[PDB]
Design a protein around this ligand. Structure first.
Ligand SMILES: *[C@@H]1O[C@H](CO)[C@@H](O[C@@H]2O[C@H](CO)[C@@H](O)[C@H](O)[C@@H]2O)[C@H](O)[C@H]1NC(C)=O
Ligand SMILES: *[C@@H]1O[C@H](CO)[C@@H](O[C@@H]2O[C@H](CO)[C@@H](O)[C@H](O)[C@@H]2O)[C@H](O)[C@H]1NC(C)=O
Ligand SMILES: *[C@@H]1O[C@H](CO)[C@@H](O[C@@H]2O[C@H](CO)[C@@H](O)[C@H](O)[C@@H]2O)[C@H](O)[C@H]1NC(C)=O
Ligand SMILES: *[C@@H]1O[C@H](CO)[C@@H](O[C@@H]2O[C@H](CO)[C@@H](O)[C@H](O)[C@@H]2O)[C@H](O)[C@H]1NC(C)=O
Ligand SMILES: *[C@@H]1O[C@H](CO)[C@@H](O[C@@H]2O[C@H](CO)[C@@H](O)[C@H](O)[C@@H]2O)[C@H](O)[C@H]1NC(C)=O
Ligand SMILES: *[C@@H]1O[C@H](CO)[C@@H](O[C@@H]2O[C@H](CO)[C@@H](O)[C@H](O)[C@@H]2O)[C@H](O)[C@H]1NC(C)=O
Ligand SMILES: *[C@@H]1O[C@H](CO)[C@@H](O)[C@H](O)[C@H]1NC(C)=O
Ligand SMILES: *[C@@H]1O[C@H](CO)[C@@H](O)[C@H](O)[C@H]1NC(C)=O
Ligand SMILES: *[C@@H]1O[C@H](CO)[C@@H](O)[C@H](O)[C@H]1NC(C)=O
Ligand SMILES: *[C@@H]1O[C@H](CO)[C@@H](O)[C@H](O)[C@H]1NC(C)=O
Ligand SMILES: *[C@@H]1O[C@H](CO)[C@@H](O)[C@H](O)[C@H]1NC(C)=O
Ligand SMILES: *[C@@H]1O[C@H](CO)[C@@H](O)[C@H](O)[C@H]1NC(C)=O
Ligand SMILES: *[C@@H]1O[C@H](CO)[C@@H](O)[C@H](O)[C@H]1NC(C)=O
Ligand SMILES: *[C@@H]1O[C@H](CO)[C@@H](O)[C@H](O)[C@H]1NC(C)=O
Ligand SMILES: *[C@@H]1O[C@H](CO)[C@@H](O)[C@H](O)[C@H]1NC(C)=O
Ligand SMILES: *[C@@H]1O[C@H](CO)[C@@H](O)[C@H](O)[C@H]1NC(C)=O
Ligand SMILES: *[C@@H]1O[C@H](CO)[C@@H](O)[C@H](O)[C@H]1NC(C)=O
Lengths: 177, 338, 621, 48, 48
């Protein structure tokens, strides 16, 4: 680019103009190429900051998804994160997030608590669910019905404050033996 | 949290050389200095659209609240969309829109009334006079509200399950019991003081609306972003009335007042001033776009963690033991209710 | 390589006039001519160029013969049928190898097509050619490059053009070039395989901004669209009194430089043609303005400083000079905006026995500040003597310009008159002889309101201009309203139409169809501008009534609005996306669907628990 | 981890034209080029 | 001289570099060479 100079070739304007006058054109070429090399440097700095942000994100993603299991939702892929496998790509990294995703579900029923004898029973870890006629305790992310025992549930209450409490019988493995 | 900035698509040709052939020919001697500027601003606009996509487009399926609204006592009418309003927006979501004033909507097609401006024309007509235009966002602020409504109706009717896979309906009392169990308190506490906690939640929601009604400006971050954008645009327009050591600052003046052999000296000065002024605007816009992208990535992570689940990291999703979060759409950003 | 050029090219899918023969019209020549012919052996010899083709102007002649060419530049007289009858002042004879090559495969069916391109940029007559053995029968479109043959600098004026014939006992394809931007695809061996225009089709304008012959699916911003003004209104003030330049050039006693007479010229119409008739000039050196461009300007005030000075002192008078006159007699300010006029007058500052009427100052205590008079007779001090008298060390300040009819030109009376203008923002009291045309509102027009040049749309206003107010502006200092000098009414000013054109295209390997997005402009404005053919875009995309769509992001031309909802494919703006969909194929625009319309089954006691699970492996880059 | 940098408030008027009136007059012809610089540095300081 | 760093002045085209034989397909009218970013690449020998 001439930048408003006689020619864009330094070896041309140097061999065509004497030093006293060629300085004017060489100054124009210098002030053009310097402003062109300060745009490249500035945009490279901005892109380097962006790439550093992305690479810090990638390092955190590696340290969390790869070197452990992340409880953060939607960080290590979509779904409940299980693993992540790294792969190297040109000027970057590629993650293979292995995730646990639920599947076919059914309307059953649920109650906040079960009131056996004046006392509200709550699940230790899970949902009180109902096939429709027989109340069952189960997990949250998978259906695995279990008989409602005193081991599955912990008891605290008076059966008059829980809204939605259902009437059912809990079992104890103690009275029988 | 800011999510996006105003999308600008400046033109060197008209901004530097308004409808001038000699000035365009002189500007062609600077090489591809302005293809770079157009590319940079196009990239900025595409990146802002991607930022909005990242922050809000987190749910594939657009969920809806049940026809009846009784979430165990929790009063959600303050954040659910209002059917009576034509815009279908939340009551808290209307205050954010009424407390932020955009200088340029972009989706106005304002041409035709700069003649009809009658009085002294404003910033927008003045910018249109010098080739300085603003593009509208890809996502309207009416379907961003739909994204927010889907996000909020998926977290109050299905818990966090809709953030992983199929949306599994769960009663709100049991969802609250699960969020409590997630912070180390047994479920029986919630079922023994459900009415009290519902009253506390309702009072907290009710007293956050007045805290935005009467405050001078709590959206000052979004307003700061908007003011920075409009003020950079204003300081870029105002550089076109600067002589830069030329005989006059008007191209149509120095062109009709000098012969082409001599007018080149002044036109070169004006070009080398306006290019260095449009390269400051582009550079500051790139820096601000990087900052806004950092903030929008933070907002997307905050949505994915606080909204689509319960977050165990302390002081990330508000102060205290985080339970849940609600997103609300604000002008060029998002508002979280932790 | 995908090199892009801007030069004179024949536009793609343009008009070429096809002739016959069985008289020989003189075709106009401008910006070059593309010539093509399809012949059996030879019926066309050469061409004639020049102006008026007579024995009064020079002309060209490029007849070929069996062995050589016969290029020349001359002033031929006529032939009316030996193709000339005059070679009077005629030189630049030239001879080289013939332009015509013909080969046959033992049969005449090989009707080779000969293509030629001529142009006359900065003289230096350029001729290009290529003989394609086609199948010239129907002038095929198969791309074909052209190689130069000879480049010779005639350096003449060419406007008309003609051709020669041959004897015997369907050709003449002529096209006209234009300055266009082309993108050329170069083969590995260096030939040119394909070329695409950059001002023909929306797809072409995109294919030449992504400098590529393949445009991937997406939306690409190419240029902007402007409505070039239809009419040009020039509204100068309501004054017709010719300026007194006559009585500043018809004077008899142009004062000496020590007292530079300064007249003021205001409330008048300045036609400097009367400035050009009273003086066979010797120096019209204008600094702030170009003397040719002086009848189209309005000046707030004009000063005419008149003084007769000597010959070298004419070169003396200029912004930023030195000498006994430029320092102690008359100093023009450095940022001068005006003209100086110097013409010879040894008929009014001369006589037998001589004259010494004029005067000048070689002795001043300091330099003269710009535009300052110093009429005073104080003896210049020398040494330390407060002496008041003439003699040695005691000098009178001003000495003579004694003018006589016989000195050299370096010593003669030039009646210098300098004109000083005030070309700033103020009511203009002096304007050129440009006529005041009518006023048209609600239409893009170039305006020259009282010397304020610009472009835009004007209309009535309800502003409250104070009676002294003349101009308008805004908060960023751009002229908004101009008070009409001949109606005393208020007119606002608009941009032309300025916006931005974005072309929405699928992959070029899929279809050549495109959609055009004019950014943030009502589509009625772009429709009326198109029908008035005043849009800067020379690529005119069709408008069938079902291809117009006023979007919140502008208006879409070339894509029809479907009322269905699909996933966003090409983002247009404001909730509207475009995609290439079957009907049998066209481009459709729609409102993006955010996802499947789903409703949850929330209830007081109903719960959904997954009875199974799946393991999904996603990827992140 | 770095938390902050040095807060600078460089002034164009004295940096570019030390105690000069003519130089300030010429600098005024460049528009609001240096109000921008002062604003950027002030924003940086407030941000730190 | 080829395969050696030399200052060339090919028909007024000054420069520096190394020259050698080519298998380019210069058309007879072609005289200079260049690349996609407009830098002189190959010069046809005026005397060979
Ligand atoms: C409630 O859950 C029961 C699982 O224990 C299901 O009852 C079963 O019924 C069969 C006879 O039909 C028994 O033989 C078996 O031992 C078991 O009790 C029952 O299907 C389910 N109810 C509903 C409505 O699904
Ligand atoms: C669950 O079972 C309780 C006793 O096993 C029920 O308490 C009874 O309540 C009725 C009135 O509803 C009294 O009349 C009776 O004496 C006894 O207190 C309780 O109601 C029941 N709850 C449900 C929901 O069935
Ligand atoms: C949920 O919270 C709403 C607050 O917006 C309640 O609406 C109220 O309606 C009364 C009139 O009945 C207004 O006076 C008041 O300003 C407010 O708008 C709504 O009743 C409440 N519903 C429940 C079930 O708690
Ligand atoms: C560029 O020029 C080369 C030299 O002629 C071409 O190579 C030739 O190809 C022909 C077949 O077409 C062979 O018979 C011959 O031996 C030689 O290899 C080359 O094809 C050409 N490249 C093009 C035209 O793209
Ligand atoms: C400069 O010389 C001009 C021509 O002689 C003067 O203009 C005219 O002067 C006559 C008197 O000589 C007036 O009657 C006439 O109206 C016109 O103004 C002009 O005055 C003179 N200026 C100075 C400052 O001497
Ligand atoms: C849970 O889902 C699995 C796949 O997602 C089911 O496995 C399938 O088993 C059938 C044979 O019964 C195969 O044909 C099929 O390819 C797949 O492997 C699995 O049965 C299912 N389990 C339940 C309880 O629904
Ligand atoms: C539960 O029942 C409702 C009522 O029709 C239904 O809409 C919903 O899909 C059901 N959910 C299931 C079967 O998971
Ligand atoms: C060429 O001329 C014909 C005859 O007037 C006209 O129909 C056609 O449109 C012209 N070509 C173009 C590209 O306009
Ligand atoms: C053709 O023109 C050349 C030009 O010098 C001339 O010498 C020759 O005699 C002409 N005729 C033939 C048959 O070549
Ligand atoms: C050539 O031009 C001169 C110009 O004065 C003219 O006098 C002379 O007659 C011309 N020769 C001709 C016409 O043969
Ligand atoms: C060339 O001829 C045209 C037509 O007569 C005329 O308008 C133009 O001024 C001429 N130019 C020159 C340089 O002779
Ligand atoms: C001066 O005025 C007289 C009036 O008759 C006119 O004839 C003459 O040409 C004029 N001369 C100049 C130099 O203006
Ligand atoms: C302009 O001049 C004409 C002719 O004297 C007059 O009729 C008209 O009123 C004038 N208009 C203005 C605005 O001065
Ligand atoms: C733009 O929109 C339509 C279409 O042209 C029309 O009402 C008018 O031209 C404009 N309206 C407004 C409100 O700007
Ligand atoms: C179908 O599209 C037309 C406009 O093209 C619109 O007026 C109409 O409401 C649409 N119908 C439906 C059902 O969306
Ligand atoms: C839930 O309970 C409330 C109050 O008991 C009642 O108004 C509502 O209709 C119930 N909804 C369902 C789905 O049972
Ligand atoms: C250069 O000139 C010499 C002397 O006539 C000759 O022998 C040689 O073939 C020429 N080479 C070229 C490439 O013209």
């Amino acid at each position: 680019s001439k930048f408003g100079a006689i020619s864009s070739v330094l070896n041309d304007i140097l061999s065509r103009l004497d030093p006293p006058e060629a300085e004017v054109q060489i100054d124009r070429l210098i002030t053009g190429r310097l402003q062109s090399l300060q745009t490249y440097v500035t945009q490279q700095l901005i892109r380097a900051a962006e790439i550093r942000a992305s690479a810090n994100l990638a390092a955190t993603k590696m340290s969390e998804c790869v070197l452990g299991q992340s409880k953060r939702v939607d960080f290590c892929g979509k779904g409940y994160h299980l693993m992540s496998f790294p792969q190297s790509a040109p000027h970057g990294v590629v993650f293979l997030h292995v995730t646990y995703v639920p599947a076919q579900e059914k309307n059953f029923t649920t109650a906040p608590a079960i009131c056996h004898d004046g006392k509200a029973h709550f699940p230790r870890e899970g949902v009180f669910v109902s096939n429709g006629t027989h109340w069952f305790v189960t997990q949250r992310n998978f259906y695995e019905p279990q008989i409602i025992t005193t081991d599955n549930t912990f008891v605290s209450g008076n059966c008059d404050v829980v809204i939605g409490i259902v009437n059912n019988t809990v079992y104890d493995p103690l009275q029988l033996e | 949290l800011p999510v996006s900035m105003t999308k600008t698509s400046v033109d060197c040709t008209m901004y530097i050389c308004g409808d001038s052939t000699e000035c365009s020919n002189l500007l062609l001697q600077y090489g591809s200095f302005c293809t770079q500027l157009k590319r940079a601003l196009t990239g900025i606009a595409v990146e802002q659209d991607k930022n909005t996509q990242e922050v809000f487009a987190q749910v594939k399926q657009i969920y809806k609240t049940p026809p009846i609204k009784y979430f165990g006592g929790f009063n959600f009418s303050q954040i659910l969309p209002d059917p009576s309003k034509p815009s279908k927006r939340s009551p808290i979501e209307d205050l954010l829109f009424n407390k932020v004033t955009l200088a340029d909507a972009g989706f106005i097609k304002q041409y035709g009334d700069c003649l009809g401006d009658i009085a002294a024309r404003d910033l927008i007509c003045a910018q249109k006079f010098n080739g300085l235009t603003v593009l509208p966002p890809l996502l309207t602020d009416e379907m961003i509200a739909q994204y927010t409504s889907a996000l909020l109706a998926g977290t109050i009717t299905s818990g966090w399950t809709f953030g992983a896979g199929p949306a599994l309906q769960i009663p709100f009392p049991m969802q609250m019991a699960y969020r409590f169990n997630g912070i180390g308190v047994t479920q029986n506490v919630l079922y023994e003081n459900q009415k009290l906690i519902a009253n506390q939640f309702n009072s907290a929601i009710g007293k956050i609306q007045d805290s935005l009604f009467s405050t001078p400006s709590a959206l000052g971050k979004l307003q700061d972003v908007v003011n920075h954008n409009a003020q950079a645009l204003n300081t870029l327009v105002k550089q076109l009335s600067s002589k830069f050591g030329a005989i006059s600052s008007v191209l149509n003046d120095i062109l009709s007042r000098l012969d082409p052999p001599e007018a080149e000296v002044q036109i070169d000065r004006l070009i080398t001033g306006r290019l260095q002024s449009l390269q400051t605007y582009v550079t500051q816009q790139l820096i601000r776009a990087a900052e806004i992208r950092a903030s929008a990535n933070l907002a997307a992570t905050k949505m994915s963690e606080c909204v689509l689940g319960q977050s165990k990291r302390v002081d990330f999703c508000g102060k205290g033991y985080h339970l849940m979060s609600f997103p609300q759409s604000a002008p060029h950003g998002v508002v979280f209710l932790h | 390589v995908l090199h892009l050029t801007q030069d004179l090219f024949l536009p793609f899918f343009s008009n070429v006039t096809w002739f016959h023969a069985i008289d020989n019209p003189v075709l106009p020549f401008n910006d070059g001519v593309y010539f093509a012919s399809t012949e059996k052996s030879n019926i066309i010899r050469g061409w004639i160029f020049g102006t008026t083709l007579d024995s009064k102007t020079q002309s060209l002649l490029i007849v070929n013969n069996a062995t050589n060419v016969f290029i020349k530049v001359c002033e031929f007289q006529f032939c009316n049928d030996g193709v000339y009858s005059s070679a009077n002042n005629c030189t630049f004879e030239y001879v080289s190898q013939p332009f015509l090559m013909d080969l046959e495969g033992k049969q005449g069916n090989f009707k080779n097509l000969r293509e030629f391109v001529f142009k006359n940029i900065d003289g230096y007559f350029k001729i290009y050619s290529k003989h394609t053995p086609i199948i010239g029968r129907d002038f095929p479109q198969g791309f074909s490059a052209l190689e130069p043959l000879v480049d010779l600098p005639i350096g003449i004026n060419i406007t008309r053009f003609q051709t020669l014939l041959a004897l015997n006992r369907a050709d003449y394809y002529v096209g006209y070039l234009q300055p266009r931007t082309f993108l050329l695809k170069y083969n590995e061996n260096g030939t040119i395989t394909d070329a695409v225009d950059c001002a023909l089709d929306p797809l072409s304008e995109t294919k030449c901004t992504l400098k590529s012959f393949t445009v991937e699916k997406g939306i690409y911003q190419t240029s902007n669209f402007r409505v070039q003004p239809t009419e040009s209104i020039v509204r100068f003030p309501n004054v017709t009194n010719l300026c007194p330049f006559h009585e500043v050039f018809n004077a008899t006693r142009f004062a000496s430089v020590y007292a530079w007479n300064r007249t003021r010229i205001s409330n008048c119409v300045a036609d400097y043609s009367v400035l050009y008739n009273f003086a066979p000039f010797f120096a019209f050196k204008c600094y702030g303005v170009s003397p040719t461009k002086l009848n189209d300007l309005c000046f707030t005030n004009v000063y005419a400083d008149s003084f007769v000075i000597k010959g070298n002192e004419v070169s003396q008078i200029a912004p930023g000079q030195t000498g006994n006159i430029a320092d102690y007699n008359y100093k023009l300010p450095d940022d001068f905006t005006g003209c100086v006029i110097a013409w010879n007058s040894n008929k009014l500052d001369s006589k037998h026995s001589g004259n010494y009427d004029y005067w000048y100052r070689l002795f001043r205590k300091s330099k003269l500040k710009p535009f300052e008079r110093d009429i005073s007779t104080e003896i210049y001090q020398a040494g330390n003597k407060p002496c008041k008298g003439k003699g040695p060390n005691c000098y009178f300040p001003l000495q003579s310009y004694g003018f006589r009819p016989t000195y050299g030109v370096g010593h003669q009376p030039y009646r210098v008159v300098v004109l000083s203008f005030e070309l700033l923002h103020a009511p203009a009291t002096v304007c050129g002889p440009k006529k005041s045309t009518n006023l048209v509102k609600n239409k893009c027009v170039n305006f020259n309101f009282n010397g304020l040049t610009g472009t835009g749309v004007l209309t009535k206003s309800n502003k409250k201009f104070l009676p002294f107010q003349q101009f308008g502006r805004d908060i960023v200092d751009t002229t908004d309203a101009v008070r009409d000098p001949q109606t005393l009414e208020i007119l606002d000013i608009t941009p032309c139409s300025f916006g931005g054109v974005s072309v929405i295209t699928p992959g070029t390997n899929t279809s050549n169809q495109v959609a055009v997005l004019y950014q943030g402009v009502n589509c009625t404005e772009v429709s009326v501008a198109i029908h008035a053919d005043q849009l800067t875009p020379t690529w005119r995309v069709y408008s069938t009534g079902s291809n117009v769509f006023q979007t919140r992001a502008g208006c879409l031309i070339g894509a029809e609005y479907v009322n269905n909802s699909y996933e966003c494919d090409i983002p247009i703006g404001a909730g509207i996306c475009a995609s290439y969909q079957t009907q049998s194929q066209s481009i459709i625009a729609y409102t993006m669907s955010l996802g499947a319309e789903n409703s949850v089954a929330y209830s007081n006691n109903s719960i959904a628990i997954p009875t199974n699970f799946t393991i999904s492996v996603t990827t992140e880059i």
